[PDB]
Amino acid sequence: MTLKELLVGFGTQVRSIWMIGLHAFAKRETRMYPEEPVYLPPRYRGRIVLTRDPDGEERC
Amino acid sequence: MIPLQHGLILAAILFVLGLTGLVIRRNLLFMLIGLEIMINASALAFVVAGSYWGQTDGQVMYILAISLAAAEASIGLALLLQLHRRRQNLNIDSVSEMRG
Amino acid sequence: MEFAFYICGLIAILATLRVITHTNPVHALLYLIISLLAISGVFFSLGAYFAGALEIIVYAGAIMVLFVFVVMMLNLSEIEQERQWLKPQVWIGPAILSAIMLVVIVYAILGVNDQGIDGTPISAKAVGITLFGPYVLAVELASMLLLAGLVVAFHVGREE
Amino acid sequence: DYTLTEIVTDPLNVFMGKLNDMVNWGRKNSIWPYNFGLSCCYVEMVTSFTAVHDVARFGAEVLRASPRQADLMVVAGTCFTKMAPVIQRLYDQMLEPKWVISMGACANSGGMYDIYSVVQGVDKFIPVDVYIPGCPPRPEAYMQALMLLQESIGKERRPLSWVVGDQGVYRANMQSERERKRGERIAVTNLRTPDEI
Amino acid sequence: WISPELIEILLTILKAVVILLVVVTCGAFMSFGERRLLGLFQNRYGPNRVGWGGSLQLVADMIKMFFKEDWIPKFSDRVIFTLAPMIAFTSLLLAFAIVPVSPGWVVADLNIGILFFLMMAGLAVYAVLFAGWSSNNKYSLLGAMRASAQTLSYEVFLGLSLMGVVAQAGSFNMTDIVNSQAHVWNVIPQFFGFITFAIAGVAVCHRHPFDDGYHIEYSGMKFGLFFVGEYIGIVTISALMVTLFFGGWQGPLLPPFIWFALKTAFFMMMFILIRASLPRPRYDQVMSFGWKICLPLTLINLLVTAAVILWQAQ
Amino acid sequence: STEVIAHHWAFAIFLIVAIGLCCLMLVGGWFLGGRALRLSAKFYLVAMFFVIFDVEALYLFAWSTSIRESGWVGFVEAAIFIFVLLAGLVYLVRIGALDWTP
Ligand SMILES: CCCCCCCCCCCCCCCCCC(=O)OC[C@H](COP(=O)(O)OCCN)OC(=O)CCCCCCCCCCCCCCCCC
Ligand SMILES: CCCCCCCCCCC1=C(C)C(=O)C(OC)=C(OC)C1=O
Ligand SMILES: CCCCCCCCCCCCCCCCCCCC
Ligand SMILES: CCCCCCCCCCCCCCCCCCCC
Ligand code: SF4
């Protein structure tokens, strides 16, 4: 293979190492479940409940 | 204070063991294994002889011996591969067609 | 140094005896590797440090690697179903012949002058000095021999 | 209140109890899941494996392509009729101890696919240790199932050696999470209105 | 029985045992350390819940692999199956057995040194081959022959990459090699030797990016032996290139063992970053790079080194 | 000498303790814990090439430890050796012996 493309490939590998190292110097993106509680938007579709009317009787 | 006689006896024992393995086995692979044993025993005998006289000549002849051993192992294993490719067996008694 | 030499020689003899009498090719190659390690220990006991180093590096690190490669290639097949070499009518004769030759060679060995191998360590520096000194043409024509083996084994061991 | 494989009591010298506790601690703190992708639930599983959730923190990121090295089988996806013998064979290839987590409604019961080509739940043919509802469960639900499995593992009794002692596996009968969380779930009165964010 | 000769014997034996325990514990501790550093490179944490900082994750893994059901395949060769992790552990352990970590702290001050390392590599290829054949699986066998062909293609120039350093030192001994770097470390003159030995050391350890797996039939504690064997190989290769190309224990200010440990730690972290950063080349590309570029580079480097040495000889 | 026999005993103890450690590890793994095709010839070719060039490498290994004691004529001899080695390598590359792809 060509020497020029070998040098280009070596420089590209060095660049990839440099980006991964600088990303090691970055900030963590992990939300620490269960120590950090998961935020859920108010209309999140999880556990189903049956609710009550303002007078206290069941709505169903 | 290690006798030269004992080293030569050990090399001779390994040589005749390799020769016995070369003769009694019909498998070509075991024949090549026996050949490797005999040439390694001869190289060991040269190492013993060189160590008795305090000379590097035994190790030089060992180097030449293992160069030969590597090359003949390569050639013999290529021949074994061709034999297994075109005969589907390694019985060396099967290849006996030319005679008399 | 004496004890190491004798135990390595005994291990090599027993391993070779197991090699020439075994049925499984991979097992036979494994005992052959054990015998090569034992003979390398013999080399190290005699002060031939370079020879033992090459015995593990080349003989027990390249040649038997090639043997193991070829055995895995063959996938070894009318071999264990015969067991013809362990019937006495096959092996008694050659064993008798090898025993006679061993007796003759040992008798010739026992009539030699022995001052004992002192086991003084001979380094690879001295071997390299004499390799490119008194044995220049040995090195060059051994390169040509390796080239011949390379060309022959490439020419034969193809598939087309 | 245990289960021997029969409802028996707790079989647990005091040194054997400490050894069993150490073995259970090492087993629950090192759980190796098997890399098996069936459907969308596997996508949420491997999402939990990534950086924003980091399931590695529990020691459960070594995702094996070989069932021999894996301890945990997460059936995460639909148990199709053609895939069910594959699932059974991969479960059989595993080694003791082995645990099973059904992830998602498909693996739980068949889910929405009550159809001719779907086996209605993976508990029809393999024993399941932890079930996760959801379609798909979110990644932290898979993490919560991992902690449920860890809590179940920490209170089970297994033989220390195959030559000494009782060789039966005693799995604890845990209290159901529904009954445990019924105290805090019913007491909820007001939630945030859906028109906000 | 109190004699100073026996005291020196016990002191040297204790030092060798301490070095062995430290290198095995380092291989295991940075199995865990590879998990943590891959987490660091990938913007996450890794295992940090089992003990303080996750330091007890390794103990839990060790217990789990100990009490996992020991399983040998029924139709497999039992001796070869047991012998493959045996070699994969002990070969690179004995390769580490010649590394000088400090003046006076060396297990074996052999006259062969890197030759002994070459022997250990020539047995590590047997470990891989035996693991492949003993599994009684054709996919594992094909993967093992491919991996062993790769490691032969890079073992063919591992020694020739070391031969520039050997030629400059004029000896095979490792202490002579680290004493020949009293002024300038060997990475500066033997730079091509450095890159070729680094490539060959990564490739013969079967590390990324030089990796139908042959470990699929291995389980229980045999897989743990394979894991710790690869990690001990990483530690051994790092310590060897520290001693051969980066002076070893030589340093201006800090104590020599601290310098050796820092350089080894940097190179092991470089292994982790190499796994995290590069993609996998194709198999034919890997072998063509090994056979067509690196081996002639080692030969030309040896010729240039010999010419430079013989020019400097007055 | 006392130092050389101390180093010999240290190496022996290193080997014995390493063998015992891995053997005891396998024994503890076995003891603890309850219970429940035709390859292509390129493999042979690359292994054969490794064998041949490893023997040539051994010749260069012997040369490299005594370069100063051999002089410039040793450099010329080893240059001829390396040139024959590289001619064989170029020969192998150009005929597709080292090309794994077809
Ligand atoms: C103890 C600590 C050790 C830690 C590790 C340190 C050393 C790491 C060594 C890693 C070695 C990786 C080698 C990869 C070789 C790949 C060769 C190859 O064939 O690459 C393919 C690619 C394209 O080739 P081509 O023939 O054009 O293919 C087109 C066909 N479709 O060809 C190319 O892209 C050409 C370039 C290939 C790679 C050149 C060498 C790169 C080496 C890695 C980067 C090192 C960065 C510095 C490290 C720290 C130094 C202090
Ligand atoms: C026998 C060969 C073993 C190679 C190493 C296997 C163990 C490490 C797995 C690393 C890993 C990979 C590749 C991976 O792809 C992955 O994403 C699903 C992970 O989880 C975060 C991992 O941990
Ligand atoms: C199918 C054909 C098989 C041919 C096998 C040939 C085996 C030859 C074995 C020879 C054994 C000789 C035993 C010793 C003879 C007496 C001593 C030598 C002569 C003085
Ligand atoms: C990855 C590193 C592996 C190292 C294995 C060997 C460890 C040997 C430890 C020796 C410690 C003492 C060294 C001499 C004293 C100088 C340093 C004193 C402060 C530690
Ligand atoms: S439960 Fe839902 S998300 Fe999971 S596999 Fe079934 S369809 Fe996909």
Kindly list the structural domains of chain F, giving each domain's residue range(s) and its CATH number in brackets, ordered by start: 2-95 (1.20.58.1610)
Closest to E59 (Cα-Cα) out of D71, D23, F29:
D23
CA distance E9 to E31: 33
Query: Does residue B21 form part of some domain?
Result: yes
CB of D42 shorter than 6 A to ligand 2: no
DSSP conformation class of C59: I
Q: Could you tell me if the CB of E39 is within 6 A of ligand 2? A: no
Is D196 part of any domain?
no
Q: Which two tokens stand for residue C54?
A: 């090459």
Cα F56 to Cα F78: distance, rounded to the nearest angstrom: 11
> What would the DSSP string read from start to end of B24-75?
H--BHHHHHHHHHHHHHHHHHHHHHHHHHTT-THHHHHHHHHHHHHHHHHHH
Rounded to whole angstroms, the Cα distance separating E141 from D69 reads 19
**How far is the CA of B86 from the CAs of B80, B89, C159, F88, in angstroms?**
10, 9, 11, 29
Q: How far apart are CA B37 and CA B14, in angstroms?
A: 7
Q: Which CA distances in Å does E225 have to D184, E7, F29, F35? A: 48, 34, 10, 20
In chain D, positions 28-47, which contact chain F (CB-CB < 8 Å)?
A: none
Identity of the amino acid at E294: C
The H or E element that residue D132 is part of is strand D130-132
**D157 forms bridges with which residues in the sheet?**
D170
Q: How far apart (Å, rounded) are the C-alpha atoms in residues D29 and D147?
A: 10
Q: Which two tokens stand for residue F94?
A: 């150009």
D104 lines ligand 5 (CB under 6 A): yes
- The answer for F 23-42 residues in CB contact with C (under 8 A) is 37-41
Q: Evaluate the omega torsion of the peptide bond into residue C121 and state whether it is cis, within 30 degrees of 0.
A: no
- Smallest CA–CA distance from D190 into chain A, residue: A51
* Contact between residue B69 and residue C143 where contact means Cβ atoms under 8 Å apart: no
Task: Give CA–CA dist D92/D70, Å, rounded.
Answer: 12
In the block, residue with structure tokens 């003990």: E51
Question: Can you tell me the distance from the alpha carbon of C61 to that of E203, in angstroms, rounded to the nearest whole number?
Answer: 17
CATH of the domain at B27: 1.10.287.3510
d(CA E19, CA E134): 33
Using an 8 Å Cβ cutoff, are C13 and B11 in contact? Answer: no
Is E127 within 8 Å of E85 (Cβ atoms)?
yes
Rounded to whole angstroms, what are the CA distances from E66 to A50, D27, D168, E90?
49, 10, 19, 19
The dihedral region occupied by E258, where left means phi > 0, alpha psi between -120 and 50, and beta the remainder, is alpha
Closest CA to E171 of F59, B62, F78, C128: C128
State the pairing for strand pair D99-103/D130-132: parallel
How many Å apart are CA A14 and CA E207, to the nearest integer? 18
In a domain, D195, yes or no: no
**Nearest alpha carbon to residue F52 among F77, F79, F89:** F89
Q: Please tell me what DSSP assigns to residue D160.
A: S
Look at residues D112, D128, D132 and name the one whose alpha carbon lies nearest to residue D120: D112
Q: H or E stretch including D137?
A: none
Give the count of domains, chain D.
Answer: 1
Buried b (16+ CB within 10 A) or exposed e, C74-106: eebeebeeeeebeeeebbeebeeebeeebeebe
Would you say how long chain B is, in residues?
A: 100
Q: Mapping DSSP to helix (H, G, I), strand (E, B) and coil, where does residue D193 land?
A: coil
The DSSP H or E segment spanning B91 is: none
Say how far apart CA C148 and CA B74 lie, in whole Å.
Answer: 11
How distant is the Cα of C82 from the closest Cα of chain E, in angstroms? 21
With beta carbons less than 8 A apart as the criterion, state whether E102 and E70 touch: no
Could you identify the residue written with the tokens 């390379």?
A: C150
CA torsion angle C113 C119 C121 C122 (round to 10): 20
Does residue D20 lie within any of the structural domains? yes
**Nearest-angstrom CA–CA distance, E17 and E297:** 39
Chain F hits for B73, CB-CB cut-off 8 Å, are 51
Q: Burial level of B3, CB count in 10 A (0-12/13-18/19+)?
A: middle
Place of tokens 């292509």: F40
Residues in chain D, total: 197
Tokens encoding E28: 């295991």
Nearest-neighbour CA in chain C from F31: distance (Å): 26
Q: CA angle, corner F51, sides to B74 and B21, nearest 5?
A: 45
Of B63, B67, B74, which is closest to F48 when you measure between CB atoms? B74
Question: Order of strands, edge to edge, in the sheet holding D130-132?
Answer: D72-76, D99-103, D130-132
Which residues, including other chains, have CB under 8 Å from residue E154's CB and lie 6 or more apart?
E199, E200, E203, E204, E210, E290, E294
Compute the distance between CA of residue F6 and CA of residue F16 in angstroms, rounded to an integer.
Answer: 15
Give the Cα separation of D93 and D95 in Å (integer).
7
Tokens representing residue F67 in the block: 């370069």
Token digits of residue E3: 């004699």
Print the SS3 string covering chain E. Answer: CCCHHHHHHHHHHHHHHHHHHHHHHHHHHHHHHHHHHHHHHCCCCCCCCCCHHHCCHHHHHHHHHHHCCCCCCCCCCHHHHHHHHHHHHHHHHHHHCCCCCECCECCCCCCCCHHHHHHHHHHHHHHHHHHHHHCCCHHHHHHHHHHHHHHHHHHHHHHHHHHHHHHHHCCCCHHHHHHCCCCCCCCCCCHHHHHHHHHHHHHHCCCCCCCCCCCCCCCCHHHHHHHHHHHHHHHHHHHHHHHHHCCCCCCCCCCHHHHHHHHHHHHHHHHHHHHHHCCCCCHHHHHHHHHHHHHHHHHHHHHHHHHHHHHHCC
In a 3-state reduction of DSSP, which class is residue D171?
Answer: strand
Beta bridge partners of E105: E102
User: Is there an interface between E and A (3+ Cβ pairs < 8 A)?
Assistant: yes
Q: Are C150 and F92 in contact (CB under 8 A)?
A: yes
B64 CA to centre of own chain: 14
Tell me the CA–centroid distance for residue B66 and ligand 3, in Å: 30
Chain C contact for F9 (CB, 8 A cutoff): no
Q: Name the token pair of C104.
A: 């003759």
Torsion of CA F42, C142, C129, C127, to 10 degrees: 70
Helix, strand, coil percentages, rounded to 5, for chain A: 35, 5, 60
Distance in Å, alpha carbon of C21 to nearest chain F alpha carbon: 26
For residues C72 and C70, give the distance between their C-alpha atoms in angstroms, rounded to a whole number: 5
H or E element in which residue C15 lies = helix C2-19
Report which DSSP code applies to C121.
-
CA neighbor of E194 nearest in space, from E232, E231, E168 = E168
Neighbours of D20 (CB within 10 A): 17
H or E segment at C62? none
Pairing of strands D99-103, D72-76: parallel
Look at residue A55 and give its three-state secondary structure: coil
Count of residues in chain F: 102
Residue nearest to atom 17 of ligand 4 (CA): E257
d(CA F80, CA C143): 10
Cis peptide before D97 (omega within 30 of 0): yes
* Residues forming beta bridges with residue D132, ordered by sequence position: D103
In contact, E204 and E151? CB cutoff 8 Å: yes
Answer yes or no: is B27 within a domain: yes
The two structure tokens encoding residue E38: 């891959």
Could you tell me the distance, in angstroms and rounded to a whole number, from the CA of residue C89 to the centre of ligand 5?
71
Q: What is the DSSP string of D65-122?
A: SSTTT--EEEEES--BTTTHHHHHHHHHTS-SS-EEEEEHHHHHH-TT--STTB-S-G
Q: Which two tokens stand for residue E36?
A: 């943590």
Query: What is the domain range of residue D133?
Result: 2-187
Cα four-point dihedral sign E207, E151, D69, D142 = positive
Using CA atoms, how far apart are residues D28 and D60, in angstroms rounded to an integer?
9
Q: Which domains does chain C have, with CATH numbers?
A: 1-157 (1.20.120.1200)
Bond before D133 cis per omega within 30 degrees = no
Burial (CB < 10 A; 0-12, 13-18, 19+), residue C133, is middle
- Whether chains A and C touch (3+ CB pairs under 8 A) is answered by no
What's the domain count of chain B? 1
C112 in Cβ contact with B4 (< 8 Å): yes
Rg (CA), chain F: 24
Strands D99-103 and D2-4: unpaired
**B77 with F44: CB under 8 angstroms?**
yes
In the structure encoding, which two tokens stand for residue E264, read together?
């080894």
3-state helix, strand, coil in chain F (%, to 5): 80, 0, 20
Q: At what angle do helices F2-31 and E57-67 cross, to 10 degrees?
A: 60
Are E123 and E155 in contact by the 8 Å Cβ rule? The answer is: no
Report residue C82 as tokens: 């015969």
Question: What does the block give as tokens for E22?
Answer: 């430290």
E65/F100 Cβ within 8 A: no
Is the minimum CB–CB distance between D158 and chain F shorter than 8 Å?
Answer: yes
Cis geometry, peptide bond prior to residue D137 (ω within 30 degrees of 0): no
| C-alpha torsion angle, residues B19, B23, B25, B31 (rounded to 10) | 60
Phi, psi dihedrals of residue F72, rounded to the nearest 5°? -70, -30
The candidate with the shortest Cα–Cα distance to C26, out of E213, E218, E120, E83, is E83
Q: Look up residue D157 and give its DSSP letter.
A: B
Residue D55 DSSP class: G
Q: What is the CA radius of gyration of chain B?
A: 17
- D104 sits in the region (left: phi over 0; alpha: psi -120 to 50; else beta) called left
Mutate which of F16, F22, F93 to disrupt the E interface (most E C-beta within 10 Å)? F22
Containing domain of residue B51, as a range? 4-94
SS3 B89: coil
CB contact under 8 A, C143 and F84: yes
Q: Amino acid letter at E40?
A: L
> In this structure, are residues E65 and E224 in contact, taking their beta carbons and an 8 Å threshold?
yes
Classify D11 as helix, strand or coil. coil
Q: How far apart are CA E14 and CA B95, in angstroms?
A: 61
* C-alpha D150: how far from chain center: 9
